[PDB]
Amino acid sequence: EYKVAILTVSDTVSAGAGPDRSGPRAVSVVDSSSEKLGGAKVVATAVVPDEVERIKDILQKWSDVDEMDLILTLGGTGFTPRDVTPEATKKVIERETPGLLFVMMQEALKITPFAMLSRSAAGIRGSTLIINMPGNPNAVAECMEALLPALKHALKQIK
Amino acid sequence: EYKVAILTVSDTVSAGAGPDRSGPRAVSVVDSSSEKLGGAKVVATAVVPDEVERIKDILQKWSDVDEMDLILTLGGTGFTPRDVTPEATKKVIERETPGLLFVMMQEALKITPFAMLSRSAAGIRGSTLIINMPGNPNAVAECMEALLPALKHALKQIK
Amino acid sequence: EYKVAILTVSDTVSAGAGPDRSGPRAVSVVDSSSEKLGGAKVVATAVVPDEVERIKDILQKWSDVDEMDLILTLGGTGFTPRDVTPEATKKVIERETPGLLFVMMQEALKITPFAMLSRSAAGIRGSTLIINMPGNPNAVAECMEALLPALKHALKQIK
Numbered sequence: 001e002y003k004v005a006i007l008t009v010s011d012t013v014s015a016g017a018g019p020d021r022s023g024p025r026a027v028s029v030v031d032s033s034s035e036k037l038g039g040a041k042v043v044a045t046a047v048v049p050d051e052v053e054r055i056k057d058i059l060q061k062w063s064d065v066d067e068m069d070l071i072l073t074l075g076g077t078g079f080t081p082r083d084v085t086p087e088a089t090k091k092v093i094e095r096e097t098p099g100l101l102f103v104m105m106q107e108a109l110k111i112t113p114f115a116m117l118s119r120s121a122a123g124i125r126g127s128t129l130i131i132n133m134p135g136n137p138n139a140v141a142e143c144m145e146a147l148l149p150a151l152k153h154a155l156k157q158i159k
Numbered sequence: 160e161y162k163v164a165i166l167t168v169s170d171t172v173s174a175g176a177g178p179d180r181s182g183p184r185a186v187s188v189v190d191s192s193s194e195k196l197g198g199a200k201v202v203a204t205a206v207v208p209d210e211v212e213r214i215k216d217i218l219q220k221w222s223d224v225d226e227m228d229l230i231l232t233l234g235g236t237g238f239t240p241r242d243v244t245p246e247a248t249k250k251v252i253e254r255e256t257p258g259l260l261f262v263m264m265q266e267a268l269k270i271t272p273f274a275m276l277s278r279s280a281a282g283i284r285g286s287t288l289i290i291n292m293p294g295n296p297n298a299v300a301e302c303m304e305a306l307l308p309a310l311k312h313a314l315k316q317i318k
Numbered sequence: 319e320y321k322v323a324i325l326t327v328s329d330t331v332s333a334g335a336g337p338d339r340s341g342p343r344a345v346s347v348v349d350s351s352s353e354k355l356g357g358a359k360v361v362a363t364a365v366v367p368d369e370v371e372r373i374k375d376i377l378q379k380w381s382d383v384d385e386m387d388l389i390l391t392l393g394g395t396g397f398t399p400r401d402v403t404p405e406a407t408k409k410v411i412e413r414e415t416p417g418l419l420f421v422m423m424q425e426a427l428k429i430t431p432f433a434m435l436s437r438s439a440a441g442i443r444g445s446t447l448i449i450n451m452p453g454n455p456n457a458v459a460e461c462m463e464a465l466l467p468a469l470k471h472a473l474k475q476i477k
Contacts, residue, residue: 079415079475081445087413095246097238099275102264105420113467116417117475124238149272157238157276254405256397258434261423286399308431316397316435 001039002069002155004030005062007046007055009076009085010135014049022074023047026133026140030072033144038152040070050076055088063092063128069155071128075135077120085132086121093123093130100131100147100154107146108139127158160198161228161314163189164221166205166214168235168244169294173208181233182206185292185299189231192303197311199229209235214247222251222287228314230287234294236279244291245280252282252289259290259306259313266305267298286317319357320473322348323386325364325376327394327403328453332367340392341365344451344458348390351462356470358388368394373406381410381446387473389446393453395438403450404439411441411448418449418465418472425464426457445476 006026012018027042034040044066048054055076062068076085100122108115120132133143144151165185171177186201193199203225207213214235221227235244259281267274279291292302303310324344330336345360352358362384366372373394380386394403418440426433438450451461462469 079472097278099277103275116421116468117472118417119415150275154238154276256437258436262434309434313397
């Protein structure tokens with residue numbers, strides 16, 4: 001009923017130099033949150049390198065052509081010079097959703113102060129909600145737990 | 160002494176299809192916060208539909224021509240495709256006031272996690288402070304309570 | 319090992335009409351946080367008036383030409399019409415670092431609600447981290463305490 005897609009952003013994974021350890025975790029978190037999200041299913045994944053054009057193209061495609069309801073990105077959100085996910089994300093979103101970002105930061109900071117190094121963006125494009133999430137496997141579970149109480153209503157409101 | 164104006168953003172109310180239930184609440188909250196705000200009075204209200212041009216025009220007019228000290232908007236801050244108040248507001252403000260947004264979000268989240276679905280913007284234009292607030296009648300009371308400790312000094316500082 | 323530079327923004331100080339009371343405090347906070355920051359030293363200070371061009375030029379110079387690792391600005395962050403530091407900073411940064419802002423706001427609000435009147439910006443330009451901090455002498459000590467747990471890793475990540 002809600003079409004979720006998960007974008008892994010990683011030079012390493014994209015080059016075939018390493019496995020995606022976060023993608024599967026994210027899929028499985030969404031999957032077991034399905035009821036709480038009002039019926040949602042991961043319907044597509046993709047891997048891109050840490051390059052803004054590659055990130056933008058997918059977000060555009062998944063929003064404008066495939067009409068996903070929810071896109072989660074993983075990675076490319078830190079202080080490393082290659083971390084460009086938020087900049088790519090900011091170019092393509094139309095309506096910022098700063099409350100989602102406030103909640104993720106607030107909860108993540110309860111676990112570790114290193115949370116302050118996340119530079120995630122989030123917003124709506126067309127009728128797709130796009131949320132940047134950190135690249136390590138536990139992050140999606142933690143962010144999804146923080147957002148989950150309200151994310152169902154978020155997706156319903158977007159229509 | 161401080162001139163407050165309150166803008167209701169709502170297709171329904173603007174079309175005459177329904178009453179403004181939030182406007183009068185906001186007026187009355189400002190009014191009974193007058194002492195705490197250093198002497199403030201709601202001096203004008205207006206209703207506009209959920210259209211960016213209509214919203215921008217009023218914010219411009221009230222800031223540039225009427226020289227309001229404080230403009231509160233109500234509504235148009237959610238995830239609904241018609242909710243365009245923050246996008247309108249972002250076009251017309253000059254200096255962001257992210258602390259006001261942090262406080263409103265932080266307090267609202269203590270009451271309900273659905274607070275994360277607010278996309279309010281806020282900032283200064285010329286010498287007018289503009290704050291987006293949620294469309295339901297209790298929200299202005301709650302946001303004003305969150306901001307009130309420091310809003311007096313905010314208005315003084317703007318001159 | 320990390321090159322820190324501290325910019326004081328103040329019409330009064332720049333004109334010679336008054337001393338810098340915050341500058342020396344900031345230098346001394348960085349200095350005595352050196353170990354915790356992985357070896358950092360204030361290597362340069364400058365004073366500029368409350369004018370965006372003056373502020374931008376220095377941030378550009380210190381980032382592009384001198385290659386500072388960390389720039390702290392002091393002052394020009396409130397609601398006063400001359401307070402233009404964040405606007406100047408926003409023009410020169412490339413990658414926002416909103417978690418640093420979230421943390422400073424969160425911690426400052428524990429001390430006083432007037433913290434919500436800070437409009438600080440922060441972000442990375444090239445490989446320089448720029449953080450706006452408030453103009454009063456105790457602020458840099460407080461903000462640095464809030465950021466310190468993670469700022470070492472921030473500077474390492476930027477390279």
